[PDB]
Amino acid sequence: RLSVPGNVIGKGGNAVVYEDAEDATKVLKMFTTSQSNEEVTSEVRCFNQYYGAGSAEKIYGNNGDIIGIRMDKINGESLLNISSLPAQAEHAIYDMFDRLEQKGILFVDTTETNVLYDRAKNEFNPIDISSYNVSWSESQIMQSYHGGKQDLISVVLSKI
Ligand SMILES: Nc1ncnc2c1ncn2[C@@H]1O[C@H](COP(=O)(O)OP(=O)(O)NP(=O)(O)O)[C@@H](O)[C@H]1O
Ligand SMILES: [Mg+2]
Ligand SMILES: [Mg+2]
Ligand SMILES: [Mg+2]
C-alpha cells in the first residue's frame, strides 16, 4: 500500500504510530480499533487548529475508509518518563494551556502520556487533541476541564 512506515514510535489502545519513512517531520498514526468518522475529523481539526494548517491529515484505504492520521512529529520526551524538571517548566505547562485555550480548545485528555516536554525549548506540546464542547452541560464541562488541567499541572510541578 501507499504510506511507508519507519520505526514504531509507540502505540496505544487505539493505534500504532510509525515514523513516516517518506517525511521525517511526520508520523503515521494507524488505527487498530474502530473510530467514528466524527472522532477522527475532530482530532485532525484540533491538531491543525493548534499546530497550524497542514499539520494533520487523514489517511485513507483504497475503499475510502479512514484508516489513520498522518501528522507532524512532535518534539520532546514523554512526561511519563521525566522525573526532574527546571523551575521554568512551571511557566511552560501554564503557557501550553493558555495556548490551547486561546485557540478555543478545552484539552480533554490531560494525561502525562499525552504531552511531550521539549527540554531545549522548555515547551510542553500536546499529542492527541480533543476539546470539550456543548452538544455535557456547561457547568459539568468546566468542572471536568478544571480537574484535568489542574491534575496535569500537579504532575509537572511535583517534578520541580
Ligand atoms: N504526533 C506525534 N509525534 C510524536 N509522537 C507521537 C505522536 N503521536 C503519537 N505519538 C507517540 O505514539 C505513542 C502512542 O500514541 P497513541 O496512539 O496516541 O496512544 P496513547 O494516547 O499514548 N494511549 P491511549 O490512551 O490508549 O490511546 C505516544 O505515546 C507517543 O509517544
Ligand atoms: Mg468506497
Ligand atoms: Mg513517572
Ligand atoms: Mg493519544
Same domain? 65 vs 82:
no
> Are the C-beta atoms of 107 and 97 separated by less than 8 Å?
yes
Single-letter amino acid code for the residue at 118: D
Number of alpha carbons in the 13 Å side-chain half-sphere of residue 11: 12
Q: How far apart are alpha carbons 105 and 153 in whole angstroms?
A: 17
- What is the distance in A from the centroid of ligand 1 to the CA of 62? 25
Experimental method: X-ray
Same domain? 159 vs 114:
yes
Same domain? 69 vs 100:
no
Single-letter amino acid code for the residue at 8: V
Residue 5 is part of a domain; what is its CATH number? 3.30.200.20
> Which residue has cell 466524527?
38
Strand ordering across the sheet containing 77-78: 77-78, 115-118, 123-126
Strands, E assignment, 113-154: 115-118, 123-126
Strands, E assignment, the chain: 5-11, 15-20, 26-31, 56-60, 66-72, 77-78, 115-118, 123-126
Stated in angstroms to one decimal place, the resolution of this structure is 1.6
Q: Which residue has its alpha carbon closest to ligand 1 atom 13?
A: 10
CA neighbor of 72 nearest in space, from 20, 7, 108, 2:
20
Residue 109 phi, psi dihedral angles, 5° rounding? -90, 85
19, 49, 73 — which closes off a domain? 73
Residue 52: exposure state from Cβ atoms within 10 A (0-12, 13-18, ≥19): exposed
Single-letter amino acid code for the residue at 45: R
Same domain? 66 vs 1:
yes
Provide the residue range defining the domain that includes 12: 1-73
Same domain? 55 vs 125:
no
Q: 35: part of which helix (H) or strand (E)? A: none
118 is in an annotated binding site: no
What cell was used for 135?
452538544
